Amino acid sequence: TKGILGRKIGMTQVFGENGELIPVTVVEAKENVVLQKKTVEVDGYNAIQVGFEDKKAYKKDAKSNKYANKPAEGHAKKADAAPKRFIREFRNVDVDAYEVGQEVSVDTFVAGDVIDVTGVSKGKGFQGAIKRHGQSRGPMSHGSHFHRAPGSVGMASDASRVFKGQKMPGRMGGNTVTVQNLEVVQVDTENKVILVKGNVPGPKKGLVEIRTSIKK
Amino acid sequence: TNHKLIEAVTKSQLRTDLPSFRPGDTLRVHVRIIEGTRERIQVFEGVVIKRRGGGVSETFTVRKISSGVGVERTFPLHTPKIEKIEVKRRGKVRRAKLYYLRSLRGKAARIQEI
Amino acid sequence: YRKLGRTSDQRKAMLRDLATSLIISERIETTEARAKEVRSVVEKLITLGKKGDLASRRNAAKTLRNVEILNEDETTQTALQKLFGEIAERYTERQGGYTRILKQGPRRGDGAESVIIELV
Amino acid sequence: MIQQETRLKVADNSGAREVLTIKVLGGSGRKTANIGDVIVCTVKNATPGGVVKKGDVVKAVIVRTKSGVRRNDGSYIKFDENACVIIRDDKGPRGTRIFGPVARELREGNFMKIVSLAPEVL
Amino acid sequence: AVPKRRTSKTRKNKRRTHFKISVPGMTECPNCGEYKLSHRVCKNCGSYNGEEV
RNA sequence: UUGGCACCUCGAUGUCGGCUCAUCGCAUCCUGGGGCUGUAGUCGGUCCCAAGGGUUGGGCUGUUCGCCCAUUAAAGCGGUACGCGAGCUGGGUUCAGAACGUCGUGAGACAGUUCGGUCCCUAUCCGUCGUGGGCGUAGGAAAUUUGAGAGGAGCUGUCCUUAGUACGAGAGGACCGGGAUGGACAUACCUCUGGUGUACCAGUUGUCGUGCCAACGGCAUAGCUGGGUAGCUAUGUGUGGACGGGAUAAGUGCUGAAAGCAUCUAAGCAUGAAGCCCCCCUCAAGAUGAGAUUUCCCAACUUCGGUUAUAAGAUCCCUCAAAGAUGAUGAGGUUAAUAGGUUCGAGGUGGAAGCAUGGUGACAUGUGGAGCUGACGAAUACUAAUCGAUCGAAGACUUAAU
Ligand SMILES: [Mg+2]
Ligand SMILES: [Mg+2]
Ligand SMILES: [Mg+2]
Ligand SMILES: [Mg+2]
Ligand SMILES: [Mg+2]
Ligand SMILES: [Mg+2]
Ligand SMILES: [Mg+2]
Ligand SMILES: [Mg+2]
Ligand SMILES: [Mg+2]
Ligand SMILES: [Mg+2]
Ligand SMILES: [Mg+2]
Ligand SMILES: [Mg+2]
Ligand SMILES: [Mg+2]
Ligand SMILES: [Mg+2]
Ligand SMILES: [Zn+2]
């Protein structure tokens, strides 16, 4: 099992051998390094901690996340690696194969590999029940004073309360989503890009976590 | 430009063989068609009503009247399915999209040649 | 862009008036949100001015309001002339940043952020 | 996209000129049909002396749609009108003539006789 | 629609825990030494970033 | 259900149907597993286990029902104030008008009918859905995390093959097994097909302006019309419910006695469902039982009690968006590409102005894929992210071990 971290550059299409159009998402997986290796002996579970995308080294009066802080720099230095913006663990990958400070490359993944891609979905802000929960609108005429309302929120004296998990208006998006059984169309070592068939969760410039499909 | 990485990955897909055509030009498009085992080229001849997009995602639409019924075919410009494109006629138009032609029929639909 | 609490037509008109006012006086006091919208509008007019072509002057004429600026010599100059004259000459060697904004702090009436925007 | 109450022209010499869609077959809750889909319909308007008559509930296959169909290669085909052919249970056309172009998707549906009778397949 | 019971003084005061105004974001002005709002021109001396405005 | 009773409510507990949104039971409508059959096969009948998921659109009627049409794997039955009117409607019913039949001497009346007929309320508390702050978690911090718990998902058709084989006189036609492709639903996303696109481009009408021409501006729904970038989107594009494991139900047994036989049960040992617990997805240490790993910071004073500002770090304030009601979150703050401007592109529009030329003129052609261009890609300190300020450790005790 293999895992790489990347940013979602955007979507495009590629023409297949048969001339079939394949919609694809461009992912850049440059600057991936194994920052730490966790084992059952020490941490109680086996995983590799991988850092993606180098950030600037510590400076005295850094006011932003662009420059690494002292605590982060130390953790990266232990791996003999530059400070990283994003760090994520991969439990799927075997600990023995990877070594601390080892670069993880796009070439690990190959074309035709079935993969599961994880990312935070795009944020929609505060949303009503119709958009958020796919509920039906009320009549738009015939005396209607019900259009985009949530509907009844309960019964009457029995219960005399709203049950937990009642679908109501609230903030929508920003959730972690894993799309399963996507495929790698192409891997570009030169550009450090992996082409993934279909669309992956989240905004452009959003971190995507590509793993080998759990279901096989 | 578009994102540099997206351009680089899809650059190979782009084809230089295709002729330069504008909307309002009659084209003859040779499309590779597979009927069962047999494969043959079928020609669709129609005015180019619309051209949209850029890069590998660029597409064009050609409109023909077949047996008294209007048919429009939208092709990916860089699709490998099209054997060749031939510009039969160059026509004068005042707009990029010739959606008005859909309503028009017979003499009204005629486009003046350049 | 910012809607500025006005309809599309009212916004366009206000931005034209604000731009013209900045051209006439070379400094104005306004709300922060209005100033941040104006900087783009004025600077794009300066860009047209520096080009100095007839098309540019005709394009500039669209945004600018028809106003008269009285010189010390008592010569009368339109805002369009001033933009394509003195203002264009001043910023010939400068690429962008024709305007600057300085925050003045809140005003009494509505507690709105008063700012000064000025050419240079 | 053909739903209930949609009226389609009939491209055949069956005797039916226009039909209204009673039902779209394919399962529970199936709403819309495109080219190559069988529909249950009634003959709203009929040409005199036809085999099919007005007020007849009949089954038909859609041959043309304004919506059109998307092909795997990323090409599209669209028509100016929605059309159907009244068909027998065997999928053979009731009429002996098909009028106007028909989509290649019909060949996949095994409506071979309609395809053969059709003047043009696009 | 309407309050069923009266709000106690306690309940009211608990709600007003967060109903407070923050101290103005101010720094001593370099030119004069009077306090000025940060990122704003000093009203007393009319100077910002060591330049008279 | 129709009733009986008159126990709560007459200083008001809104009443039928529909809509919106469900939630629960199982006496199971479909799908799953079985026993028996008057079970040849395909189909059925009946009974037992099973509530995981699913369980359609129309015509008539205020209707609920019911009938009908066309479907479907199936069109389940009930409870929740005949769920749900401070969520909606108001057709029926149950005010004032009017009319018919009928009854009444009459005024009038009729679970008879007909036409018309005002549905208020700014959420205090609990509850529910989102989103912050405080304190705690025995030093102060930056990250990466485990998962006690919890939620989500859970559905099915058809076709091909096995096989015209099993079975059958024939007609017809399996299981079991292996593939393929749909319907409905869920979710993510905008490459494609479309929608929108009020600071994009073009055409055009009336009128009033910029002195006039030319060229433009205002107003007329954005005046109107044809297109359309980003973003947001479905009807568009992907993906999912896979394969499995453990324990079981109704069942089916193996060995086996009480009970020399028999016996699935008593001891013991197997097998056995869409169901249970997992597997898959998301949340999760206020899990006060507050967990783990890695890294960073670590001094002086002192009344010897402790204090101090400072460290690591984080904020104020400011430039912002991939985030957003506001907080928060994220990108940045000169040792700087965060935004604007500028420069160059993408995409869009479709040939600017000016001038020349041809025409009597309306116009056409050339210069020239021209000119212009919100959000998109890149580059560039020209402008603004100034100068500053605030908060923020020094690590309790007991016992055991070392
Ligand atoms: Mg609806
Ligand atoms: Mg309304
Ligand atoms: Mg209520
Ligand atoms: Mg009594
Ligand atoms: Mg009372
Ligand atoms: Mg039962
Ligand atoms: Mg009720
Ligand atoms: Mg009524
Ligand atoms: Mg009356
Ligand atoms: Mg009565
Ligand atoms: Mg796009
Ligand atoms: Mg006008
Ligand atoms: Mg004129
Ligand atoms: Mg007026
Ligand atoms: Zn001062």
Q: Which amino acid is located at A81 in the chain?
A: A
Q: Which amino acid is located at C22 in the chain?
A: L
Look at residue D7 and give its three-state secondary structure: strand
Q: How many helices (H) and strands (E) does chain B have?
A: 2, 5
Domains of chain D as residue ranges with CATH: 1-122 (2.40.150.20)
Residue in the block written with tokens 């003046």: B112
Q: How far apart are CA A25 and CA A10, in angstroms?
A: 6
Residue in A162, A173, A176 with CA at minimum distance from that of residue A127: A173
Residue ranges with strand state E in D33-82: 38-46, 57-64, 69-70, 76-79
Report the structure determination method.
Answer: cryo-EM
Strand pairing category for C27-31 and B82-89: unpaired
Residue in the block written with tokens 């104006």: C38
Taking a C-beta distance cutoff of 8 angstroms, is the pair A65, A87 a contact? no
Domains of chain C as residue ranges with CATH: 2-120 (3.90.1030.10)
Q: How far apart are CA A177 and CA A202, in angstroms?
A: 8
Chain B residues interacting with chain A (CB cutoff of 8 angstroms)? 3, 5-6, 8-10, 13, 32, 55-57, 76, 78-81
Which nucleotides of strand F are protein-proximal, with an atom < 7 A from a CB? 19-23, 55-58, 69-75, 80-81, 83-90, 121-133, 141-147, 151-152, 157, 182-194, 198-199, 210, 215-220, 222-223, 226-229, 231-233, 235-242, 279-283, 292-297, 312-320, 322-325, 330-337, 340-343, 345-354, 365, 369, 371-378, 380, 382-389
Phi, psi of A11 (to 5 degrees): -110, 155
CA angle A189, A192, A197 (to 5 degrees): 90
* CA to C1' distance (Å), from A24 to F109: 81
Q: Which domain holds residue A3?
A: 1-215
Optimal mutation site among A12, A15, A21, A24, interface D, most CBs of chain D within 10 A: A21
Taking a C-beta distance cutoff of 8 angstroms, is the pair D35, D7 a contact? no
Q: What resolution in angstroms, rounded to 1 decimal?
A: 2.7
Q: How far apart are CA C31 and CA A61, in angstroms?
A: 32
Neighbours of B60 (CB within 10 A): 21
Q: How far apart are CA A148 and CA A138, in angstroms?
A: 7
Residue in the block written with tokens 């999928």: D91
Q: How far apart are CA A6 and CA A25, in angstroms?
A: 12
Q: How far apart are CA A87 and CA A32, in angstroms?
A: 9
Shortest alpha-carbon distance between residue D57 and chain A (Å): 33
Q: How far apart are CA D71 and CA D105, in angstroms?
A: 9
CA angle B101, B104, B108 (to 5 degrees): 105
Residue ranges with strand state E in chain D: 7-10, 16-24, 38-46, 57-64, 69-70, 76-79, 83-86
Question: Exposed/middle/buried for E7, CB within 10 Å: 0-12, 13-18, 19+?
Answer: exposed
Look at residue A177 and give its three-state secondary structure: strand
Taking a C-beta distance cutoff of 8 angstroms, is the pair A9, A27 a contact? yes
The reply to whether residue B57 touches residue A14, judged by beta carbons under 8 angstroms, is: no
Taking a C-beta distance cutoff of 8 angstroms, is the pair D116, D102 a contact? no
Residue D34 has which token pair?
A: 């495109």
Taking a C-beta distance cutoff of 8 angstroms, is the pair A84, A33 a contact? yes
Residue in the block written with tokens 């900045």: C22
DSSP D80: S
CA angle D69, D75, D81 (to 5 degrees): 40
Optimal mutation site among C29, C31, C104, interface E, most CBs of chain E within 10 A: C104
Look at residue A192 and give its three-state secondary structure: coil
Give the gyration radius of chain D's Cα atoms.
Answer: 13
Q: Find the helix or strand (DSSP H, E) in which A72 lies.
A: helix A70-78
Taking a C-beta distance cutoff of 8 angstroms, is the pair B44, B62 a contact? yes
Question: Exposed/middle/buried for A144, CB within 10 Å: 0-12, 13-18, 19+?
Answer: exposed
Q: Which residues contact B83 (CB under 8 A, 6 or more apart)?
A: B30, B31, B32, B41
DSSP string, B20-79: P--TT-EEEEEEEEEETTEEEEEEEEEEEEEEE--GGG-EEEEEEEETTEEEEEEEETT-
Residue B107 has which token pair?
A: 């003499």
Neighbours of C65 (CB within 10 A): 17
Strand pairing category for E47-48 and C68-70: unpaired
- Distance between start and end Cα atoms, chain C: 23
Look at residue C41 and give its three-state secondary structure: helix
The reply to whether residue B10 touches residue A12, judged by beta carbons under 8 angstroms, is: yes
Residue in A91, A97, A100 with CA at minimum distance from that of residue A46: A91
Q: Which residues contact B91 (CB under 8 A, 6 or more apart)?
A: B24, B25, B26, B47, B111, B112, B113, B114
Q: Find the helix or strand (DSSP H, E) in which E3 lies.
A: none
Look at residue C111 and give its three-state secondary structure: coil
Taking a C-beta distance cutoff of 8 angstroms, is the pair D118, D105 a contact? no
Statement: the CB of E6 is under 7 Å from strand F: no
Helix, strand, coil content of chain A in percent (nearest 5):
10, 40, 50
Q: Which residues contact A50 (CB under 8 A, 6 or more apart)?
A: A3, A4, A5, A32, A33, A34, A35, A87, A88, A89, A90, A104
Q: How far apart are CA B66 and CA B46, in angstroms?
A: 10
The reply to whether residue B8 touches residue A10, judged by beta carbons under 8 angstroms, is: no
With the C-alpha atoms ordered D23, D28, D32, D34, is the resulting torsion angle positive or negative? negative
Residue C75 has which token pair?
A: 């010569």
Phi, psi of C47 (to 5 degrees): -60, -45
Determine the distance from the C-alpha atom of residue E1 to the mean position of all C-alpha atoms in its chain, rounded to a whole number: 35
Domain boundaries, chain B: 1-109
Sheet strands side by side (includes B38-52)? B82-89, B26-35, B38-52, B59-66, B69-76, D76-79, D69-70
Q: What residues are paired with B46 via a beta bridge?
A: B27
DSSP string, E12-49: HHHHTTS--PPPP-EEE-TTT--EEETTB--TTT-EET
Q: Which amino acid is located at A131 in the chain?
A: K
CA angle D71, B28, B58 (to 5 degrees): 50
Q: How far apart are CA D65 and CA D21, in angstroms?
A: 14
Q: What residues are paired with A15 via a beta bridge?
A: A21
Domain boundaries, chain E: 2-50
Q: How far apart are CA A130 and CA A149, in angstroms?
A: 8
Q: How far apart are CA B40 and CA B43, in angstroms?
A: 10
With the C-alpha atoms ordered A169, A170, A174, A178, is the resulting torsion angle positive or negative? negative
Taking a C-beta distance cutoff of 8 angstroms, is the pair A49, A87 a contact? yes
Q: Which amino acid is located at D71 in the chain?
A: R
Q: How far apart are CA A62 and CA A71, in angstroms?
A: 13
Q: What residues are paired with D21 via a beta bridge?
A: D41
Look at residue A130 and give its three-state secondary structure: helix
Q: What residues are paired with A52 via a beta bridge?
A: A32, A86
Strand pairing category for B59-66 and C68-70: unpaired
Residue A155 has which token pair?
A: 């019964």
Phi, psi of E5 (to 5 degrees): -130, 160
Q: What residues are paired with D11 via a beta bridge?
A: none
Q: Does D80 touch chain B (CB under 8 A)?
A: yes
Residue D117 has which token pair?
A: 């009778």
Strand pairing category for D7-10 and D83-86: parallel
Q: Find the helix or strand (DSSP H, E) in which A14 lies.
A: strand A3-15
Nearest CA in chain D to A18: D73
Taking a C-beta distance cutoff of 8 angstroms, is the pair D60, D41 a contact? yes
Number of domains in chain A: 1
Q: Find the helix or strand (DSSP H, E) in which A25 lies.
A: strand A21-28
Residue in A108, A118, A7, A120 with CA at minimum distance from that of residue A54: A7
Q: How many residues can be counted in chain A?
A: 216
Q: Which amino acid is located at C35 in the chain?
A: A
Nearest CA in chain D to B102: D80
Nearest-10 crossing angle of helices C54-63, C32-51: 160
Determine the distance from the C-alpha atom of residue C51 to the mean position of all C-alpha atoms in its chain, rounded to a whole number: 17
Q: What SS3 string covers C45-110?
A: HHHHHHHCCHHHHHHHHHHCCCCEEECCCCCEEEHHHHHHHHHHHHCCCCCCCCEEEEEEEECCCC
Q: How far apart are CA A149 and CA A24, in angstroms?
A: 38
Residue in the block written with tokens 């709600």: E15
The reply to whether residue C102 touches residue E43, judged by beta carbons under 8 angstroms, is: no
Q: Which residues contact D3 (CB under 8 A, 6 or more apart)?
A: D21, D24, D31, D32, D33
Statement: the CB of B4 is under 7 Å from strand F: yes
Question: Exposed/middle/buried for A11, CB within 10 Å: 0-12, 13-18, 19+?
Answer: middle
Q: Which residues contact C29 (CB under 8 A, 6 or more apart)?
A: C104, C114, C115, C116
Q: How far apart are CA A114 and CA A94, in angstroms?
A: 18
DSSP A188: E
Q: How many residues can be counted in chain E?
A: 53
